[PDB]
Amino acid sequence: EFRPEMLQGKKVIVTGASKGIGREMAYHLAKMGAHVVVTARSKETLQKVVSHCLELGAASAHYIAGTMEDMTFAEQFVAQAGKLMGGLDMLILNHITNTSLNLFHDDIHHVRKSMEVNFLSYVVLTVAALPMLKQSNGSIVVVSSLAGKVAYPMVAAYSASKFALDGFFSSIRKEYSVSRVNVSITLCVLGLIDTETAMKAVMQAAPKEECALEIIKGGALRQEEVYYDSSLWTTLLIRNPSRKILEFLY
Amino acid sequence: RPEMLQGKKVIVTGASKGIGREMAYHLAKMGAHVVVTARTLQKVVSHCLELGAASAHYIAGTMEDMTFAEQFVAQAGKLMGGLDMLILNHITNTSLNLFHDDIHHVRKSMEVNFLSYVVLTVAALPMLKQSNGSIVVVSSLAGKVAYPMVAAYSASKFALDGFFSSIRKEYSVSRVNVSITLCVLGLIDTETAMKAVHMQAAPKEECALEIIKGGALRQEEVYYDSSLWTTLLIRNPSRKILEFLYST
Amino acid sequence: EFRPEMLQGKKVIVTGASKGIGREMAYHLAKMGAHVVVTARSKETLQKVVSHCLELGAASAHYIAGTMEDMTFAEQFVAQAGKLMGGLDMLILNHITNTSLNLFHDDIHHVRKSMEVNFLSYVVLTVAALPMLKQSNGSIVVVSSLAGKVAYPMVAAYSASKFALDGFFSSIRKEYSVSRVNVSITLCVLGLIDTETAMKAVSGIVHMQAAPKEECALEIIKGGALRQEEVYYDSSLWTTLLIRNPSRKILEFLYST
Amino acid sequence: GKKVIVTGASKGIGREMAYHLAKMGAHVVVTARSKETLQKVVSHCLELGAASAHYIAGTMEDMTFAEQFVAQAGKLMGGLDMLILNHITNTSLNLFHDDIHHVRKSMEVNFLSYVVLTVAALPMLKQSNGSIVVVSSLAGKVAYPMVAAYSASKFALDGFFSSIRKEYSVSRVNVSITLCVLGLIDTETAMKAHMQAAPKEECALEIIKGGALRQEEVYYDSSLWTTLLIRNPSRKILEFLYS
Ligand SMILES: NC(=O)c1ccc[n+]([C@@H]2O[C@H](COP(=O)([O-])OP(=O)(O)OC[C@H]3O[C@@H](n4cnc5c(N)ncnc54)[C@H](OP(=O)(O)O)[C@@H]3O)[C@@H](O)[C@H]2O)c1
Numbered sequence: 001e002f003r004p005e006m007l008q009g010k011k012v013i014v015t016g017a018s019k020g021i022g023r024e025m026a027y028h029l030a031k032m033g034a035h036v037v038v039t040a041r042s043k044e045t046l047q048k049v050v051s052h053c054l055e056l057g058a059a060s061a062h063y064i065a066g067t068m069e070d071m072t073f074a075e076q077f078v079a080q081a082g083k084l085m086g087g088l089d090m091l092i093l094n095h096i097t098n099t100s101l102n103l104f105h106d107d108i109h110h111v112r113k114s115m116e117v118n119f120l121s122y123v124v125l126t127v128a129a130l131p132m133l134k135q136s137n138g139s140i141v142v143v144s145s146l147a148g149k150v151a152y153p154m155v156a157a158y159s160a161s162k163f164a165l166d167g168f169f170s171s172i173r174k175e176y177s178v179s180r181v182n183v184s185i186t187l188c189v190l191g192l193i194d195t196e197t198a199m200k201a202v203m204q205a206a207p208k209e210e211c212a213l214e215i216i217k218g219g220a221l222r223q224e225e226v227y228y229d230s231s232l233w234t235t236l237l238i239r240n241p242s243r244k245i246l247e248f249l250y
Numbered sequence: 251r252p253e254m255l256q257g258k259k260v261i262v263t264g265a266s267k268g269i270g271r272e273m274a275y276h277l278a279k280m281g282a283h284v285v286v287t288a289r290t291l292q293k294v295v296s297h298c299l300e301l302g303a304a305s306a307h308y309i310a311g312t313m314e315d316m317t318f319a320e321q322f323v324a325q326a327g328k329l330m331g332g333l334d335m336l337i338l339n340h341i342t343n344t345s346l347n348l349f350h351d352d353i354h355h356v357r358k359s360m361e362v363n364f365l366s367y368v369v370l371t372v373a374a375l376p377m378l379k380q381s382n383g384s385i386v387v388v389s390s391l392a393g394k395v396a397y398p399m400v401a402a403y404s405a406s407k408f409a410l411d412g413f414f415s416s417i418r419k420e421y422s423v424s425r426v427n428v429s430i431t432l433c434v435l436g437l438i439d440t441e442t443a444m445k446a447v448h449m450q451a452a453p454k455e456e457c458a459l460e461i462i463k464g465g466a467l468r469q470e471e472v473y474y475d476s477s478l479w480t481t482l483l484i485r486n487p488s489r490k491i492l493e494f495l496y497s498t
Numbered sequence: 499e500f501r502p503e504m505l506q507g508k509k510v511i512v513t514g515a516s517k518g519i520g521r522e523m524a525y526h527l528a529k530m531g532a533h534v535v536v537t538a539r540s541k542e543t544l545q546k547v548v549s550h551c552l553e554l555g556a557a558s559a560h561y562i563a564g565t566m567e568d569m570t571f572a573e574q575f576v577a578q579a580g581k582l583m584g585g586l587d588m589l590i591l592n593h594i595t596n597t598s599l600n601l602f603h604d605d606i607h608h609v610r611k612s613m614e615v616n617f618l619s620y621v622v623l624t625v626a627a628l629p630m631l632k633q634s635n636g637s638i639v640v641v642s643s644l645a646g647k648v649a650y651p652m653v654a655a656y657s658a659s660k661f662a663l664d665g666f667f668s669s670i671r672k673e674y675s676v677s678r679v680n681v682s683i684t685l686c687v688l689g690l691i692d693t694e695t696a697m698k699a700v701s702g703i704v705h706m707q708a709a710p711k712e713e714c715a716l717e718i719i720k721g722g723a724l725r726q727e728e729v730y731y732d733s734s735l736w737t738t739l740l741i742r743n744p745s746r747k748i749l750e751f752l753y754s755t
Numbered sequence: 756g757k758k759v760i761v762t763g764a765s766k767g768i769g770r771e772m773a774y775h776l777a778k779m780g781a782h783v784v785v786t787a788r789s790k791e792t793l794q795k796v797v798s799h800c801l802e803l804g805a806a807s808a809h810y811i812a813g814t815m816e817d818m819t820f821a822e823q824f825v826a827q828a829g830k831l832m833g834g835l836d837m838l839i840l841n842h843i844t845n846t847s848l849n850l851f852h853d854d855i856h857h858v859r860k861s862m863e864v865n866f867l868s869y870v871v872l873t874v875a876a877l878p879m880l881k882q883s884n885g886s887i888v889v890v891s892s893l894a895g896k897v898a899y900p901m902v903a904a905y906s907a908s909k910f911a912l913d914g915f916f917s918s919i920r921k922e923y924s925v926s927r928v929n930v931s932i933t934l935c936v937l938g939l940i941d942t943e944t945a946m947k948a949h950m951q952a953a954p955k956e957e958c959a960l961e962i963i964k965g966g967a968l969r970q971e972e973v974y975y976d977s978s979l980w981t982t983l984l985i986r987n988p989s990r991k992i993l994e995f996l997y998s
């Protein structure tokens with residue numbers, strides 16, 4: 001079972017931590033006395049978040065501002081974050097490029113950036129953080145969505161990026177479960193959450209602060225997948241036993 | 251009915267070797283207009299015409315190049331004066347390997363295996379809109395479930411499902427009468443695949459055939475594996491519920 | 499004297515902010531910690547700008563993409579931007595329709611599009627902002643040109659719309675003095691500036707030194723912050739001097755009675 | 756015997772110009788919206804020795820009318836020597852609030868219609884090596900309150916017609932363009948709308964004189980003081996400098 005003391009003194013990265021769920025996660029991590037490095041584009045808002053993390057009781061708290069459209073930044077960020085903390089125990093991959101509910105016409109650039117920020121940068125950040133996490137026997141936490149497990153209209157490019165996370169990180173999970181690499185991988189399937197962006201872009205939305213905690217919890221407990229939706233009807237059918245079998249079979 | 255492919259205008263990517271080739275042959279034998287592509291093609295074009303192909307042309311190039319991909323569909327459209335079935339089959343080359351460091355291969359996989367299919371589809375959309383046609387996406391078990399050794403690949407095929415399943419439901423809620431067929435294929439007896447992977451491997455001829463059948467029939471998904479125990483279990487009933495459920 | 503701190507936490511709009519001078523202005527405003535909302539038609543290039551402004555230290559940075567051919571968009575843009583920032587201090591009217599130096603024959607559609615985008619939308623945007631500007635005792639910054647003060651060939655439709663800005667905004671400036679509305683109106687008269695667009699359009703026909711866009715942009719903002727009536731900016735100091743019109747300031751000060 | 760168009764010629768300075776033009780034995784086509792007052796002007800023109808005199812009614816809100824008006828007036832006279840653009844939309848003195856309609860309408864009638872009318876006349880004018888006369892205002896060279904929309908339209912004329920004047924200058928196109936900056940004039944419209952006002956009858960003459968003499972600009976005010984100031988030598992320098 002989960003105890004907030006499991007995070008005390010743990011060295012933790014939170015991406016897309018300036019707004020929404022990622023911010024809540026940083027604050028939670030702080031109140032559990034964790035070393036935290038937050039990141040996002042907003043140089044200004046990030047510093048505001050760091051100050052609040054120290055007040056809430058972070059062992060330490062830094063920011064590095066940048067955009068995850070830049071794969072170079074992502075490599076460097078992990079190196080620099082590891083320097084500021086003296087290691088890394090948990091990498092939380094939460095950031096997304098902004099997406100709207102729209103029928104797809106011909107916007108190939110939106111598909112491309114979506115795939116870059118929402119998927120590729122996670123692989124880059126993963127690669128850079130893997131030495132430290134192998135050493136700490138750490139966790140990678142991937143934030144995904146219902147839209148990454150089931151099809152919904154109006155969100156194709158986004159959905160395509162969330163499906164890839166599952167495909168790529170689940171394949172890696174198995175690869176770590178045989179090469180003995182003792183890093184856990186936690187895919188989080190979230191329903192609608194009551195963040196500013198989500199509401200001002202669109203069902204019942206679950207509370208952001210409780211959501212953030214469930215992500216941290218699942219990651220701390222080293223769970224393979226985490227589900228969180230405002231409904232229990234939703235959450236229960238999102239699991240898929242047919243897959244567990246096929247996988248176990250081969 | 252093999253008559254449904256009579257005189258229809260079709261593109262087949264990755265049609266130089268393996269399944270894409272067999273798809274061209276079967277399509278030639280039903281007398282369809284075909285434009286094949288890859289980077290051996292002429293040898294393929296010969297056999298196609300002499301099997302009963304209404305018209306068989308080619309355009310060689312790399313689907314690494316998105317500009318090439320956008321032009322190809324137009325040029326192939328010029329060459330046939332319209333389009334009824336776009337078949338997306340090509341993939342960049344993959345060796346079974348523990349993913350360690352290869353961000354290059356990850357990025358190229360998303361480009362060729364996923365991103366090009368989207369470019370091709372944008373280009374073909376006008377012609378397919380008028381012809382009330384069909385898009386056929388060749389995917390894999392690895393686009394439905396996880397396997398080690400193939401992460402980059404799995405991610406690209408997963409990407410296809412997320413994307414094309416999403417625009418499928420979009421077209422229903424726009425009445426755009428273009429069908430979308432995701433082909434979930436188990437191990438097939440193609441040249442390259444055998445020289446990369448123990449398990450029973452299905453025959454490439456019934457595969458190519460099966461794919462085309464499903465595309466012609468406008469089936470949402472096509473399953474095909476040398477194990478019939480699996481094929482029933484590879485379908486996901488849990489998912490179909492939730493999609494119709496949230497359809498509110 | 500102007501202090502970069504003057505703009506910190508000030509809520510600002512910049513139109514035409516995807517390229518050239520508008521882009522540079524947004525950047526400068528970001529460095530100074532301003533709340534910024536940018537606009538133009540291209541949402542891809544606008545997203546790039548918003549990212550950079552956040553990196554550079556914008557208090558906030560949004561965009562809203564649309565054409566200023568649409569007066570509905572312009573009237574709405576301000577509302578949405580006002581919402582995003584919780585007010586408005588400075589309105590910077592920078593965008594123009596695309597125009598290429600060509601002798602005028604019969605192109606009335608160009609002429610009408612030039613008055614629409616270059617002049618009319620500015621009026622629309624101003625009307626929309628004035629309520630929020632009144633409250634903050636804010637500023638309107640109107641970017642014009644030498645071709646808005648003197649005649650040049652090949653750019654008639656353009657010239658006419660720029661001249662028109664002068665007549666109109668100069669008139670409501672005097673209105674606001676009398677009515678005691680405390681909103682400043684800064685008209686910026688610029689020579690050739692080394693923006694990508696300008697160079698591509700003048701390159702093989704016009705011989706002159708182009709002033710730097712980065713400096714140009716900073717001048718406008720300073721002029722607007724210091725609530726100056728006119729800002730002049732050309733690479734030649736001869737030009738910047740003989741641009742002002744004293745005889746006109748007399749005539750205006752005469753009829754003030 | 757010169758063929759001339761006069762727009763906004765039902766009253767005020769337009770009407771007075773029509774009279775002077777008739778009294779010099781010129782062929783004249785007048786226009787405005789009101790058919791009734793136009794009929795009256797056509798006759799008084801016939802009385803004063805007009806070589807010919809007809810009217811065509813219509814609103815210069817309509818660019819189709821303007822385009823076709825110049826065509827019809829040109830056929831009716833078999834050519835054109837002088838185009839006098841004088842008309843304006845009805846404008847009051849008011850602090851501008853949010854009435855974008857007035858602003859849009861002002862640029863349409865007062866500036867945009869003039870361009871259309873000009874474009875239409877150009878072949879006939881090139882043929883006669885004729886003249887465009889644009890009536891403008893103090894408020895088109897300097898800023899006054901209460902008249903924002905109006906001034907904007909007048910400024911626009913200056914910008915536009917001064918640019919094309921330098922255009923025709925290098926194309927060698929032999930059509931003169933005369934910009935007329937007028938102070939307050941004692942027209943009925945003007946009056947209803949505490950300074951001294953010049954006489955409408957002399958002003959009209961001054962406009963006609965300047966256009967006949969192919970002057971670039973004409974100034975006219977009830978004050979010798981203003982007229983001297985209204986000129987801009989800084990402008991002439993950089994205009995000629997950047998040449
Ligand atoms: N909200 C929901 O209902 C919901 C549901 C399911 C899954 N999720 C997942 O939860 C995660 C976050 O959701 P959210 O609602 O919290 O999103 P959000 O509130 O919009 O926050 C997104 C974060 O990413 C940052 N960001 C945006 N563009 C970036 C870029 N190019 N490089 C780096 N950072 C960038 C943003 O900060 P800056 O703008 O300052 O850069 C912000 O901190 C995402 O993975 C999303 O897919 C959310």
Ligand SMILES: NC(=O)c1ccc[n+]([C@@H]2O[C@H](COP(=O)([O-])OP(=O)(O)OC[C@H]3O[C@@H](n4cnc5c(N)ncnc54)[C@H](OP(=O)(O)O)[C@@H]3O)[C@@H](O)[C@H]2O)c1
Pocket residue numbers: 263264265266267268269270287288289290311312313314338339340341342343362388389390391435436437438439440441442443
């Ligand atoms: N074989 C199986 O067991 C199996 C199982 C499940 C799914 N699938 C799927 O079925 C499809 C066909 O696979 P396959 O085994 O037939 O493959 P294959 O025999 O290796 O054929 C690959 C095809 O793609 C072309 N290609 C390679 N790189 C390309 C590029 N950059 N741009 C454009 N074309 C390129 C190749 O032509 P060139 O070499 O001349 O360029 C060739 O025609 C694939 O989508 C695969 O994922 C296959």
Ligand SMILES: NC(=O)c1ccc[n+]([C@@H]2O[C@H](COP(=O)([O-])OP(=O)(O)OC[C@H]3O[C@@H](n4cnc5c(N)ncnc54)[C@H](OP(=O)(O)O)[C@@H]3O)[C@@H](O)[C@H]2O)c1
Pocket residue numbers: 513514515516517518519520537538539540543564565566567591592593594595596615641642643644688689690691692693694695696
């Ligand atoms: N560069 C010079 O030498 C110079 C000299 C004197 C005066 N100026 C003045 O400075 C200002 C900016 O000039 P610049 O050279 O920086 O211009 P620019 O680089 O051409 O930028 C024009 C901006 O306006 C936007 N725009 C164009 N058409 C639009 C429309 N229909 N609706 C909305 N936005 C539109 C463009 O974005 P999208 O196309 O993506 O919408 C772009 O962001 C103008 O007012 C110009 O008159 C410039």
Ligand SMILES: NC(=O)c1ccc[n+]([C@@H]2O[C@H](COP(=O)([O-])OP(=O)(O)OC[C@H]3O[C@@H](n4cnc5c(N)ncnc54)[C@H](OP(=O)(O)O)[C@@H]3O)[C@@H](O)[C@H]2O)c1
Pocket residue numbers: 762763764765766767768769786787788789792813814815816840841842843844845864890891892893937938939940941942943944945
């Ligand atoms: N009055 C002054 O003190 C003064 C001073 C400086 C400059 N100016 C300029 O001198 C010119 C003459 O002014 P003014 O005082 O003579 O004016 P006015 O006496 O009111 O004459 C205006 C003329 O324009 C016509 N008109 C109005 N709306 C029209 C429309 N939509 N389409 C076509 N014609 C239309 C009127 O005819 P209908 O009403 O019958 O349609 C009338 O014949 C104007 O360009 C003005 O700006 C005047």
Ligand SMILES: CC1=CC[C@@]2(C[C@@H]1O)[C@@H](C(=O)O)CC[C@H]2C(C)C
Pocket residue numbers: 099100101144145146147152155190191192193198201202
């Ligand atoms: C039905 C549904 C679709 C997806 C989203 C809402 C909800 O989960 C959420 C998600 O990222 O999963 C938040 C934003 C929204 C997007 C449509 C932009």
Ligand SMILES: CC1=CC[C@@]2(C[C@@H]1O)[C@@H](C(=O)O)CC[C@H]2C(C)C
Pocket residue numbers: 344345346390391392397399400435436437438443446447
């Ligand atoms: C277990 C299994 C994994 C995937 C593949 C074999 C089989 O389907 C096939 C596929 O693409 O689906 C062909 C190539 C191969 C890859 C490991 C390279």
Ligand SMILES: CC1=CC[C@@]2(C[C@@H]1O)[C@@H](C(=O)O)CC[C@H]2C(C)C
Pocket residue numbers: 597598599642643644645650653656688689690691696699700
């Ligand atoms: C002589 C001269 C004329 C005007 C311009 C160049 C220069 O200032 C500049 C302006 O907007 O003022 C930029 C674009 C250009 C136009 C001719 C298209």
Ligand SMILES: CC1=CC[C@@]2(C[C@@H]1O)[C@@H](C(=O)O)CC[C@H]2C(C)C
Pocket residue numbers: 846847848891892893894899902905937938939940945948
């Ligand atoms: C101070 C002054 C302003 C302009 C006008 C009077 C004078 O010239 C004249 C003009 O058009 O030039 C006539 C109408 C009037 C307007 C205020 C309505």
